[PDB]
Amino acid sequence: VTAKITLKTDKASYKPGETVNFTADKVFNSSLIRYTHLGKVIKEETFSGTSWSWLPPSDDFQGYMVAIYQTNDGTQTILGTVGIDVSSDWAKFPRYGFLSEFGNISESDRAAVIDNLKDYHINGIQFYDWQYRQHQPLAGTVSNPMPVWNDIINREVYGSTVSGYIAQAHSKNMKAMFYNLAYGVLNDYDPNLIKQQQFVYKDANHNDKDKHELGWPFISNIYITDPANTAWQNYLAQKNDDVYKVYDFDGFHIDQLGDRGNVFRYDGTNADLKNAFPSFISAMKSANTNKKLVMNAVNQYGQKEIAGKELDFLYTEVWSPNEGFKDLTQVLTDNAAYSNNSKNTVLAAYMNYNKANNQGMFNTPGVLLTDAVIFAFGGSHLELGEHMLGKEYFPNKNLSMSAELKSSLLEYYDFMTAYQNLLRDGGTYTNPTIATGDGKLNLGSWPPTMGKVAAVGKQVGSREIIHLLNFTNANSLNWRDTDGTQNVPDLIKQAMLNLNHSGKVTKIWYASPDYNGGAAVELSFSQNGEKVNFKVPVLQYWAMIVVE
Numbered sequence: 172v173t174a175k176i177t178l179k180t181d182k183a184s185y186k187p188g189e190t191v192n193f194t195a196d197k198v199f200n201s202s203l204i205r206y207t208h209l210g211k212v213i214k215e216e217t218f219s220g221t222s223w224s225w226l227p228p229s230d231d232f233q234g235y236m237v238a239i240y241q242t243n244d245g246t247q248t249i250l251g252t253v254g255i256d257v258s259s260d261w262a263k264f265p266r267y268g269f270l271s272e273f274g275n276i277s278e279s280d281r282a283a284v285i286d287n288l289k290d291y292h293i294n295g296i297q298f299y300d301w302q303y304r305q306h307q308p309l310a311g312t313v314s315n316p317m318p319v320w321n322d323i324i325n326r327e328v329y330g331s332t333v334s335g336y337i338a339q340a341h342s343k344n345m346k347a348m349f350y351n352l353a354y355g356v357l358n359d360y361d362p363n364l365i366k367q368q369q370f371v372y373k374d375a376n377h378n379d380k381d382k383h384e385l386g387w388p389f390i391s392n393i394y395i396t397d398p399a400n401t402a403w404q405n406y407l408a409q410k411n412d413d414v415y416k417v418y419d420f421d422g423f424h425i426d427q428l429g430d431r432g433n434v435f436r437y438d439g440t441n442a443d444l445k446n447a448f449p450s451f452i453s454a455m456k457s458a459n460t461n462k463k464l465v466m467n468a469v470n471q472y473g474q475k476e477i478a479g480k481e482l483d484f485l486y487t488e489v490w491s492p493n494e495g496f497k498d499l500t501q502v503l504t505d506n507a508a509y510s511n512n513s514k515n516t517v518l519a520a521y522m523n524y525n526k527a528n529n530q531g532m533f534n535t536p537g538v539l540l541t542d543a544v545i546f547a548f549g550g551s552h553l554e555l556g557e558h559m560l561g562k563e564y565f566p567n568k569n570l571s572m573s574a575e576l577k578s579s580l581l582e583y584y585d586f587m588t589a590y591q592n593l594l595r596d597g598g599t600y601t602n603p604t605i606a607t608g609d610g611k612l613n614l615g616s617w618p619p620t621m622g623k624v625a626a627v628g629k630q631v632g633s634r635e636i637i638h639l640l641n642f643t644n645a646n647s648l649n650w651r652d653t654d655g656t657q658n659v660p661d662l663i664k665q666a667m668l669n670l671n672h673s674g675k676v677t678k679i680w681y682a683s684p685d686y687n688g689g690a691a692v693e694l695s696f697s698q699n700g701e702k703v704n705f706k707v708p709v710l711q712y713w714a715m716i717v718v719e
């Protein structure tokens with residue numbers, strides 16, 4: 172939290188040709204703003220005030236880091252950094268957050284929420300439990316929408332807040348996705364509209380409807396309909412249209428309850444929900460072709476089946492037995508394969524889960540290690556809204572983030588924005604041949620081993636990337652850090668590395684969210700044959716080495 176300046180930009184992301192407006196919280200003398208692309212300086216200018224603008228290069232889907240340097244005795248110091256995403260649309264590089272509270276909140280309170288998210292470069296937002304009813308997400312009618320409604324826990328939801336947040340998210344270049352289930356009905360539905368033939372039953376004689384039981388303070392259990400059923404699809408498409416004509420959501424965050432076991436259609440056939448979802452997705456899209464769709468594969472239920480459908484990117488809510496770091500990276504690897512490398516993924520992976528049964532703090536090194544793995548592997552984490560997620564019920568805010576975690580996490584979002592081209596824009600994973608030169612690092616491959624630094628290589632274009640992920644001081648390899656026990660890694664400094672690399676090396680550079688706000692630092696190096704050596708300045712959680 173050493174950064175002398177907080178450097179922010181006005182929007183979350185920028186379409187090609189949009190102007191970037193910067194704010195620094197304070198100014199220093201004899202300082203230079205450097206604009207970098209993949210470690211290359213593309214622009215330098217004098218740091219001349221707190222507010223200034225930059226027209227970035229117009230090529231689409233491009234991250235940059237901006238770093239301010241002071242000259243002191245002729246040495247320099249990084250003062251502050253900010254990542255910048257130039258994307259036309261969010262789906263290539265999704266940075267998904269949420270919103271959870273839609274009561275009478277002031278415009279300036281909403282602004283502070285959206286602004287904070289913006290500083291993490293959040294590029295769209297899942298609006299969780301904004302809706303009236305699973306089976307009728309719009310309260311009232313299109314011509315007469317209800318200004319205030321009660322949600323599934325009977326709390327008050329204001330139209331003006333929903334509309335307002337949509338407008339605020341829009342002013343910051345963010346997309347707004349409305350939450351609903353694919354197939355939810357609560358007990359006040361109209362039976363003349365959702366007929367008996369549309370439900371899923373736990374037995375074969377259309378006796379007992381399948382249902383997710385919710386106790387107090389929820390108003391109803393959730394009945395389940397068949398996503399493939401055409402009357403259902405047409406019914407809900409009308410509901411979505413209704414919503415879209417009232418609230419200017421960009422699309423529908425489709426949620427579900429995961430594997431229901433053996434369930435039946437009315438007619439006694441097997442409902443086989445994972446093979447019903449593809450049809451549902453296509454029906455939703457064809458009824459609203461200008462609106463976005465993302466669907467949650469709960470613990471990967473449906474994922475193979477849906478990966479080639481009309482989804483912006485893939486999403487996976489992670490549960491047991493997927494609890495290891497190596498299980499997180501397996502979900503990312505699987506989602507690549509299922510989508511034949513067409514779609515990146517967002518992970519809903521609730522940290523400090525057990526601890527969040529009570530008020531407390533998030534365990535900073537757990538949150539950072541987990542995001543260092545996810546972001547190093549080209550994933551993305553839905554974790555931030557008005558607060559950070561501790562539970563699948565998004566409004567729960569039992570755990571707070573320290574000011575240290577806030578700070579750090581801002582630099583991690585900066586890092587994964589700035590270096591998105593290296594992290595999740597094509598290439599192939601490789602196992603680098605790398606060894607400590609000095610004994611300072613105890614080096615292994617991935618998947619990780621407690622006590623060792625795991626090296627992960629990726630060939631992106633003509634670049635070789637090596638990510639160092641520090642498990643030296645890890646006391647579990649469980650991502651969730653459910654009880655907040657994980658350790659803070661000891662710093663390792665000036666660690667000599669040896670790397671086999673045929674092909675002349677032109678430049679090696681380093682960047683770490685744990686060192687100089689992720690600014691790129693060029694390293695010295697020698698090359699004898701295939702043997703290259705160099706020193707990394709710092710490893711805490713996650714360093715990235717780039718060989719060109």
Ligand SMILES: OC[C@H]1O[C@@H](O)[C@H](O)[C@@H](O)[C@@H]1O
Nearest residue numbers: 500503504507548600601617
């Ligand atoms: O998704 C990253 C994973 O991708 C696979 O292609 C590689 O073989 C693994 O080594 C790697 O961890």
Ligand SMILES: OC[C@H]1O[C@H](O)[C@H](O)[C@@H](O)[C@@H]1O
Nearest residue numbers: 300305323351352355385564
């Ligand atoms: O856990 C309670 C949750 O159950 C379901 O996921 C509902 O769709 C959602 O509205 C509610 O928040």
Ligand SMILES: OC[C@H]1O[C@H](O)[C@H](O)[C@@H](O)[C@@H]1O
Nearest residue numbers: 456460462463480481482483
């Ligand atoms: O991959 C998702 C995309 O699938 C198709 O190309 C749809 O027509 C488009 O609306 C959607 O965004």
Ligand code: NA
Nearest residue numbers: 184258261294
């Ligand atoms: Na974007």
